Amino acid sequence: DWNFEKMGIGGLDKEFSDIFRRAFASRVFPPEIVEQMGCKHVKGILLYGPPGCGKTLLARQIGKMLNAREPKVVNGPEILNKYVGESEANIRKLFADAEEEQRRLGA
Amino acid sequence: NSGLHIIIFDEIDAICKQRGSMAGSTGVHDTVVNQLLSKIDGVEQLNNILVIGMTNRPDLIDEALLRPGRLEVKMEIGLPDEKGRLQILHIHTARMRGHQLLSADV
Amino acid sequence: ALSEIETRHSEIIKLENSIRELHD
Ligand SMILES: Nc1ncnc2c1ncn2[C@@H]1O[C@H](COP(=O)(O)OP(=O)(O)O)[C@@H](O)[C@H]1O
């Protein structure tokens, strides 16, 4: 579904093809066959550009379209607090938040 | 219908500089900048406040504070014109003319 | 160091409680 242009953001009519072809390539197939093939899922997207272009809107929209959990977020340099060790404890906290769920519910 | 709360940061340039430029071991300046930026702009919403700051050089101001929605408005105070000079002098000498201590020559 | 100070805060709370039990 590509009402994105009319969803509320103009953007471009070319990105979505690449984005969701890669996403489908990654996550559509059943876990067992993907494991057997031993291919690695895509984990990581880079966005950049001048402000005021709707990057946050694009992020929310893409997060909503995919059937995933409510998106969790963090600040830009607040991660670098005036302390040595916070940059470890807080980051480990953020990752452990989902690690606990993965352990509980399993693979 | 709360009202208005107006806070003034005299010599705002004293405490606000580039976040990453500073190499001092302690990061007090960065922490205060972060706290103020979070307070002014963030998830929490404020609608009954007005912050105004004054500097004597806009050069030492980090761009994050100039971001629209926080300090979008700006204004320069240039030099007075001749007519403004006349009005200024009138104001500066009203008392003296009040007590008859100014010679008619001037 | 943050965990240390947090543990010491817990300790001071416990100390208050115990001195709040021994006095009475
Ligand atoms: N095509 C668009 N339609 C409607 N609003 C837009 C569009 N592009 C940008 N905006 C507005 O501009 C802002 C984009 O800010 P953004 O550039 O994401 O900030 P940052 O760079 O800090 O993420 C949003 O508030 C959004 O409402």
* Experimental technique for the deposited model: cryo-EM
CA atoms within 13 A on the CB side of B48: 5
**Residues in CB range of A104: below 8 A, 6 or more apart:** none
Distance A56 CA to ligand 1 centre (A): 7
- Chain B positions in Cβ-Cβ contact with residue A82 (cut-off 8 Å): 26-28, 30-31
**R_g of chain B, CA atoms, integer Å:** 21
Tokens of B44: 């929490």
Residue A101 CA: distances (Å) to CA of A27, A88, B34? 19, 20, 31
Residue C21 CA: distances (Å) to CA of A61, A102, C12, C13, C17? 57, 44, 14, 12, 6
- Give partners of A (≥3 CB pairs < 8 A): B, C
DSSP sequence for B25-77: SS-HHHHHHHHHHHHHSSSS---SEEEEEE-S-GGG--HHHHSTTTS------
What is d(CA B53, CA B7) in angstroms, rounded to the nearest whole number? 8
∠ at Cα B69 (B64, B73), nearest 5°? 90
What is d(CA A88, CA B49) in angstroms, rounded to the nearest whole number? 36
Of A75, A77, A82, the CB nearest to B28: A82
Distance A10 CA to ligand 1 centre (A): 11
Confirm if B39 and B85 have CB atoms less than 8 A apart: no
Three-state DSSP class for B9?
A: strand
**Best CA proximity match to A59, nearest among A43, A46, A77:** A46
Task: DSSP letter for A47, please.
Answer: -
Would the CB atoms of B19 and A77 count as touching at under 8 Å? yes
Confirm if A69 and A105 have CB atoms less than 8 A apart: no
Distance A66 CA to ligand 1 centre (A): 21
